[PDB]
């Protein structure tokens, strides 16, 4: 699970 | 979507990653903050939801030395502390 993947769930 | 006007410290953060305006959508604010964390490699390499913001403008903005990307309501709450919402 990459930072990018996590950051996306914020939207 | 809402348009927002970042307060000065958030504005400085946004600008350090290329943003040149004074009014943003929340989507632009999240995108740029994401870019800031990625480009500065502030996330834990093994557990990439963990972000370290101590000793960084982000920690002064957020008021915490670390947080988790999974903490959605805390993240938005911290961001809103640093924004004036248009209207």
Coordinates of N, CA, C and O in Angstrom, one line a residue, unseen atoms left out:
Chain A
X1 N 0.9 -1.2 0.0 CA 0.0 0.0 0.0 C 0.9 1.2 0.0 O 1.6 1.5 1.0
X2 N 0.8 2.0 -1.1 CA 1.7 3.1 -1.3 C 1.1 4.4 -0.8 O -0.1 4.5 -0.6
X3 N 1.9 5.4 -0.6 CA 1.4 6.7 -0.1 C 0.4 7.2 -1.0 O -0.7 7.7 -0.6
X4 N 0.7 7.2 -2.3 CA -0.3 7.6 -3.3 C -1.6 6.9 -3.2 O -2.7 7.6 -3.2
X5 N -1.6 5.6 -3.0 CA -2.9 4.8 -2.8 C -3.7 5.3 -1.6 O -4.9 5.6 -1.7
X6 N -3.0 5.5 -0.5 CA -3.6 6.0 0.7 C -4.1 7.5 0.5 O -5.3 7.7 0.9
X7 N -3.3 8.3 -0.1 CA -3.7 9.7 -0.3 C -5.0 9.9 -1.1 O -5.9 10.7 -0.7
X8 N -5.2 9.0 -2.0 CA -6.4 9.0 -2.9 C -7.7 8.7 -2.1 O -8.8 9.2 -2.6
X9 N -7.7 8.0 -1.0 CA -8.9 7.7 -0.3 C -9.5 9.0 0.4 O -10.6 9.0 0.9
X10 N -8.6 10.0 0.4 CA -9.1 11.3 1.0 C -10.1 12.0 0.2 O -10.9 12.8 0.7
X11 N -10.0 11.8 -1.1 CA -11.0 12.4 -2.0 C -12.3 11.6 -1.9 O -12.5 10.6 -2.6
Chain B
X1 CA -16.7 22.3 -5.3 C -16.7 23.6 -4.5 O -17.1 24.7 -5.0
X2 N -16.3 23.6 -3.3 CA -16.2 24.8 -2.5 C -14.9 25.5 -2.9 O -13.9 24.8 -3.1
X3 N -14.9 26.8 -2.9 CA -13.7 27.5 -3.0 C -13.2 27.9 -1.7 O -14.0 28.2 -0.8
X4 N -11.9 27.9 -1.5 CA -11.3 28.3 -0.2 C -10.1 29.2 -0.4 O -9.5 29.2 -1.5
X5 N -9.8 30.0 0.6 CA -8.6 30.9 0.7 C -7.7 30.5 1.8 O -7.9 30.7 3.0
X6 N -6.6 29.8 1.4 CA -5.6 29.4 2.4 C -5.1 30.5 3.2 O -4.8 31.6 2.7
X7 N -4.9 30.3 4.5 CA -4.2 31.2 5.4 C -2.7 31.2 5.0 O -2.3 30.3 4.2
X8 N -1.9 32.1 5.6 CA -0.6 32.3 5.0 C 0.4 31.1 5.1 O 1.2 30.9 4.1
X9 N 0.4 30.3 6.1 CA 1.4 29.3 6.2 C 1.0 28.1 5.2 O 1.9 27.6 4.6
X10 N -0.3 27.9 5.1 CA -0.7 26.9 4.1 C -0.4 27.4 2.7 O 0.0 26.7 1.8
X11 N -0.6 28.7 2.5 CA -0.3 29.3 1.2 C 1.2 29.0 0.8 O 1.5 28.7 -0.3
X12 N 2.1 29.2 1.8 CA 3.5 29.0 1.6 C 3.8 27.6 1.3 O 4.6 27.3 0.4
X13 N 3.1 26.7 2.0 CA 3.2 25.2 1.6 C 2.8 25.0 0.2 O 3.6 24.3 -0.6
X14 N 1.7 25.4 -0.2 CA 1.1 25.2 -1.5 C 2.1 25.7 -2.6 O 2.3 25.1 -3.6
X15 N 2.6 26.9 -2.3 CA 3.5 27.6 -3.3 C 4.9 26.9 -3.4 O 5.4 26.8 -4.5
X16 N 5.4 26.4 -2.3 CA 6.6 25.6 -2.3 C 6.4 24.3 -3.3 O 7.4 23.8 -3.7
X17 N 5.2 24.0 -3.7 CA 5.0 22.9 -4.6 C 4.3 23.3 -5.9 O 3.8 22.5 -6.7
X18 N 4.4 24.6 -6.2 CA 4.1 25.1 -7.6 C 2.8 25.9 -7.7 O 2.5 26.5 -8.7
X19 N 2.0 25.9 -6.6 CA 0.7 26.6 -6.7 C 0.9 28.1 -6.6 O 1.7 28.5 -5.8
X20 N 0.3 28.9 -7.5 CA 0.6 30.3 -7.6 C -0.6 31.2 -7.3 O -0.5 32.4 -7.4
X21 N -1.7 30.7 -6.9 CA -3.0 31.4 -6.7 C -3.3 31.7 -5.2 O -2.6 31.1 -4.4
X22 N -4.3 32.4 -5.0 CA -4.8 32.7 -3.6 C -6.1 31.9 -3.3 O -6.4 31.8 -2.1
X23 N -6.8 31.5 -4.3 CA -8.1 30.8 -4.1 C -8.1 29.4 -4.8 O -7.7 29.3 -6.0
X24 N -8.5 28.4 -4.1 CA -8.4 27.0 -4.5 C -9.7 26.3 -4.3 O -10.5 26.7 -3.5
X25 N -9.8 25.1 -4.9 CA -10.8 24.2 -4.5 C -10.2 23.3 -3.4 O -9.0 23.2 -3.3
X26 N -11.0 22.6 -2.7 CA -10.5 21.6 -1.7 C -9.7 20.6 -2.5 O -8.7 20.0 -2.0
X27 N -10.2 20.2 -3.7 CA -9.4 19.2 -4.5 C -8.0 19.6 -4.8 O -7.1 18.8 -4.7
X28 N -7.8 20.9 -5.2 CA -6.5 21.4 -5.4 C -5.7 21.4 -4.1 O -4.5 21.1 -4.2
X29 N -6.3 21.8 -3.0 CA -5.6 21.8 -1.8 C -5.1 20.4 -1.4 O -3.9 20.2 -1.1
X30 N -6.0 19.4 -1.5 CA -5.5 18.1 -1.2 C -4.5 17.6 -2.2 O -3.5 16.9 -1.8
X31 N -4.6 17.9 -3.5 CA -3.6 17.5 -4.4 C -2.2 18.0 -4.1 O -1.3 17.3 -4.0
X32 N -2.2 19.3 -3.9 CA -0.9 19.9 -3.6 C -0.2 19.4 -2.3 O 1.0 19.3 -2.2
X33 N -1.0 19.3 -1.2 CA -0.6 18.7 0.0 C 0.0 17.3 -0.2 O 1.0 17.0 0.4
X34 N -0.7 16.5 -1.0 CA -0.2 15.2 -1.4 C 1.1 15.3 -2.1 O 2.0 14.6 -1.7
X35 N 1.2 16.2 -3.0 CA 2.5 16.4 -3.7 C 3.6 16.8 -2.7 O 4.8 16.4 -2.9
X36 N 3.3 17.7 -1.8 CA 4.3 18.1 -0.8 C 4.8 17.0 0.0 O 6.0 16.8 0.2
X37 N 3.9 16.1 0.5 CA 4.3 15.0 1.3 C 5.1 14.0 0.5 O 6.2 13.5 0.9
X38 N 4.7 13.7 -0.7 CA 5.4 12.8 -1.6 C 6.8 13.3 -2.0 O 7.8 12.6 -1.8
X39 N 6.9 14.5 -2.5 CA 8.1 15.1 -2.9 C 9.2 15.3 -1.8 O 10.4 15.2 -2.1
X40 N 8.7 15.6 -0.6 CA 9.6 15.7 0.5 C 9.9 14.4 1.2 O 10.7 14.4 2.1
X41 N 9.3 13.3 0.7 CA 9.4 12.0 1.3 C 9.2 12.0 2.8 O 10.0 11.5 3.6
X42 N 8.1 12.6 3.2 CA 7.7 12.7 4.6 C 7.0 11.4 5.2 O 6.7 11.4 6.4
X43 N 6.7 10.5 4.3 CA 5.9 9.3 4.7 C 6.9 8.2 5.1 O 8.0 8.2 4.6
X44 N 6.4 7.3 5.9 CA 7.2 6.2 6.4 C 7.4 5.2 5.3 O 6.4 4.8 4.6
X45 N 8.6 4.7 5.0 CA 8.8 3.9 3.8 C 8.1 2.5 3.9 O 7.6 2.0 2.8
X46 N 8.0 2.0 5.1 CA 7.4 0.7 5.3 C 5.9 0.7 5.5 O 5.2 -0.1 5.0
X47 N 5.5 1.8 6.2 CA 4.0 1.9 6.4 C 3.6 3.3 5.8 O 3.7 4.3 6.5
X48 N 3.3 3.3 4.6 CA 3.2 4.6 3.8 C 2.1 5.5 4.1 O 1.9 6.5 3.5
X49 N 1.2 5.0 5.1 CA 0.1 5.9 5.5 C 0.6 6.8 6.6 O 0.0 7.8 7.0
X50 N 1.8 6.5 7.1 CA 2.3 7.3 8.2 C 3.1 8.5 7.7 O 4.0 8.3 6.8
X51 N 2.8 9.7 8.1 CA 3.5 10.9 7.7 C 4.2 11.6 8.9 O 3.5 11.8 9.9
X52 N 5.4 11.9 8.8 CA 6.2 12.6 9.8 C 6.2 14.1 9.4 O 6.8 14.4 8.4
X53 N 5.6 15.0 10.3 CA 5.7 16.4 9.9 C 6.4 17.3 10.9 O 6.5 18.5 10.7
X54 N 7.1 16.7 11.9 CA 7.9 17.4 12.8 C 9.1 18.1 12.0
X55 N 9.6 19.2 12.5 CA 10.7 19.8 11.9 C 10.4 20.2 10.5 O 11.3 20.3 9.7
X56 N 9.2 20.5 10.2 CA 8.8 20.8 8.9 C 7.6 21.8 9.0 O 6.9 21.8 10.0
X57 N 7.4 22.7 8.0 CA 6.3 23.6 8.0 C 5.0 22.8 8.2 O 4.1 23.4 8.8
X58 N 4.9 21.6 7.7 CA 3.7 20.9 7.8 C 3.3 20.6 9.2 O 2.1 20.7 9.6
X59 N 4.3 20.4 10.1 CA 4.0 20.2 11.5 C 3.5 21.4 12.2 O 2.8 21.4 13.2
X60 N 4.0 22.6 11.7 CA 3.6 23.9 12.3 C 2.1 24.2 11.8 O 1.3 24.8 12.6
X61 N 1.8 23.7 10.6 CA 0.5 23.9 10.0 C -0.5 23.0 10.7 O -1.7 23.4 11.0
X62 N -0.1 21.8 11.0 CA -1.0 20.8 11.5 C -1.0 20.7 13.1 O -2.0 20.4 13.7
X63 N 0.1 21.1 13.7 CA 0.2 21.1 15.1 C 0.5 19.8 15.8 O 0.4 19.6 17.0
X64 N 0.9 18.8 15.0 CA 1.2 17.4 15.4 C 2.5 17.0 14.8 O 2.9 17.6 13.7
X65 N 3.3 16.1 15.4 CA 4.6 15.8 14.7 C 4.4 14.6 13.8 O 5.3 14.3 13.0
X66 N 3.2 13.9 13.8 CA 3.0 12.8 12.9 C 1.5 12.6 12.7 O 0.7 13.0 13.6
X67 N 1.1 12.0 11.7 CA -0.3 11.6 11.5 C -0.4 10.4 10.5 O 0.5 10.1 9.8
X68 N -1.6 9.8 10.5 CA -1.9 8.8 9.5 C -2.8 9.2 8.4 O -3.9 9.8 8.7
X69 N -2.5 8.9 7.2 CA -3.4 9.3 6.0 C -4.8 8.6 6.2 O -5.7 9.1 5.6
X70 N -4.8 7.5 6.9 CA -6.1 6.9 7.1 C -7.1 7.6 8.0 O -8.2 7.3 8.2
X71 N -6.5 8.7 8.7 CA -7.3 9.5 9.6 C -8.0 10.6 8.9 O -7.7 11.8 9.1
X72 N -9.0 10.2 8.1 CA -9.6 11.2 7.2 C -10.2 12.4 7.9 O -9.9 13.6 7.5
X73 N -11.0 12.2 8.9 CA -11.6 13.4 9.6 C -10.6 14.3 10.3 O -10.8 15.5 10.3
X74 N -9.5 13.7 10.8 CA -8.5 14.5 11.4 C -7.8 15.4 10.4 O -7.5 16.5 10.6
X75 N -7.4 14.7 9.2 CA -6.7 15.5 8.1 C -7.6 16.7 7.7 O -7.1 17.8 7.6
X76 N -8.8 16.4 7.3 CA -9.7 17.5 6.8 C -9.8 18.6 7.9 O -9.8 19.7 7.6
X77 N -9.9 18.2 9.2 CA -10.1 19.1 10.2 C -8.9 20.1 10.3 O -9.0 21.3 10.5
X78 N -7.7 19.5 10.2 CA -6.5 20.2 10.3 C -6.4 21.2 9.1 O -6.0 22.3 9.3
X79 N -6.7 20.7 7.9 CA -6.7 21.5 6.7 C -7.7 22.7 6.9 O -7.3 23.9 6.7
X80 N -8.9 22.5 7.3 CA -9.9 23.5 7.5 C -9.5 24.6 8.5 O -9.9 25.7 8.4
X81 N -8.7 24.2 9.5 CA -8.2 25.2 10.5 C -7.3 26.2 9.8 O -7.2 27.4 10.2
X82 N -6.8 25.8 8.6 CA -5.8 26.7 7.9 C -6.4 27.3 6.6 O -5.7 27.7 5.8
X83 N -7.7 27.3 6.5 CA -8.4 27.8 5.3 C -9.5 28.8 5.8 O -10.1 28.7 6.9
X84 N -9.8 29.8 5.0 CA -11.1 30.5 5.1 C -12.0 30.0 3.9 O -11.6 30.2 2.8
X85 N -13.2 29.6 4.2 CA -14.1 29.1 3.1 C -14.8 30.3 2.5 O -15.5 31.0 3.1
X86 N -14.7 30.4 1.2 CA -15.3 31.5 0.5 C -16.9 31.5 0.6 O -17.5 30.4 0.5
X87 N -17.4 32.6 0.9 CA -18.8 32.8 1.3 C -19.1 32.7 2.8 O -19.0 31.7 3.4

